């Protein structure tokens with residue numbers, strides 16, 4: 001975990017995220033999305049659970065990206081929840097929630113759900 | 124948003140989260156869960172999109188809590204994705220993903236999905 | 247369950263669904279949505295698990311509505327997954343997935359997630 | 370769609386589902402799960418939206434399986450929401466919700482979310 005998590009990861013859509021997993025469960029980094037109302041890099045912050053494992057389980061973690069930077073303001077935020085599996089072919093398997101800011105009338109349709117798999121190799 | 128978000132919020136399960144929304148989209152604080160394999164306060168970190176709105180839309184945001192502190196290590200992490208609606212009765216409406224670290228055989232059943240509504244009043 | 251489920255239910259958005267729970271786990275009926283690219287009644291079909299419970303647990307069930315009828319064709323389908331809780335104030339608590347048919351380029355953003363609570367009283 | 374959907378499909382976990390898509394949006398068939406508190410075949414019912422598409426979009430559909438048959442009663446139900454993409458390598462991409470019947474105290478953790486991809490070839 002931690003050391004194993006720090007680095008550059010790529011997902012199936014071609015997005016890239018660079019993260020640093022700190023000693024006490026913090027995750028900090030940047031995310032560049034290959035799809036969406038996203039342009040350039042966005043700041044990401046999250047946490048991982050730093051004391052994962054005598055039965056080769058994954059390390060649970062999550063992070064958030066607010067889609068606003070100096071080139072775009074998409075009025076939305078995405079959170080990724082999943083686990084890090086290390087090894088030869090280490091990966092982070094996630095499910096994500098993308099919520100857009102809406103008026104109250106459209107709040108029922110404000111959130112998209114999806115899944116992303118990240119690897120150290122692209123892809 | 125931001126100022127409006129900073130403070131103490133409570134949800135329908137009796138959990139409490141105190142957050143500070145910083146000038147540039149950062150969210151930092153603590154979360155105390157009334158249910159689960161959770162005991163005491165846990166650190167939370169997230170982001171909000173700091174330039175939300177000429178049509179009274181909500182402010183999108185998200186945060187993560189890794190369920191590990193000095194009293195418990197639940198080997199899981201939860202991410203909340205939603206939006207802040209301010210006003211008289213301001214609230215943060217969210218959907219969450221709770222992922223547990225599992226062996227590869229059980230990874231298909233590693234994530235729970237739910238929804239929480241937070242208010243400034245409890246509840 | 248079954249008998250308890252058969253009837254008319256209403257949710258927080260003002261939608262109404264009439265269902266008949268058959269002896270062997272089948273659910274058949276119609277759904278009229280108060281929001282969306284929906285007009286009139288749509289056919290629904292689902293299942294419930296007909297042998298639910300010495301510890302007052304809910305009865306798990308699910309149903310699907312394809313948003314096509316003789317007045318509208320929204321090219322989408324919604325599935326509701328949840329449980330029936332009977333009693334004085336019986337309710338069906340659900341989480342739903344609404345998938346729209348998209349081109350392959352937009353498949354990552356094809357599904358919305360939400361939650362609906364149905365009661366026998368409106369609302 | 371419809372004709373294209375009728376047949377046997379397999380997913381990444383080795384589950385198999387045989388379905389018949391009827392002329393007016395109905396889906397009927399059986400599902401055999403390779404994982405879980407599932408043994409043998411279970412009945413499935415759903416709907417698809419029968420008038421999908423001048424821009425090669427997928428056909429939205431959904432189905433439900435209550436995990437009860439003559440060999441097992443898992444007190445749960447799963448709904449799959451997604452779209453059918455036809456062609457050489459046709460597939461049905463889905464996201465699913467598995468709800469278990471719980472007591473009211475545990476209702477917040479009653480639903481798991483996941484994703485399955487089905488192909489006509491196994492896998």
Ligand SMILES: O=C1N[C@H]2NC(=O)N[C@H]2N1
Nearest residue numbers: 013015033035036078098
């Ligand atoms: O990498 C990405 N994953 C998808 N989820 C999301 O929010 N934007 C898309 N880009």
Ligand SMILES: O=C1N[C@H]2NC(=O)N[C@H]2N1
Nearest residue numbers: 136138156158159201221
């Ligand atoms: O406040 C809480 N919300 C629920 N989601 C979660 O992860 N733990 C529970 N407590």
Ligand SMILES: O=C1N[C@H]2NC(=O)N[C@H]2N1
Nearest residue numbers: 259261279281282324344
């Ligand atoms: O009743 C409704 N619930 C929401 N989900 C959905 O698919 N349409 C909306 N209407």
Ligand SMILES: O=C1N[C@H]2NC(=O)N[C@H]2N1
Nearest residue numbers: 382384402404405447467
């Ligand atoms: O095929 C399967 N998919 C998964 N979802 C589910 O409910 N059971 C598992 N089996």
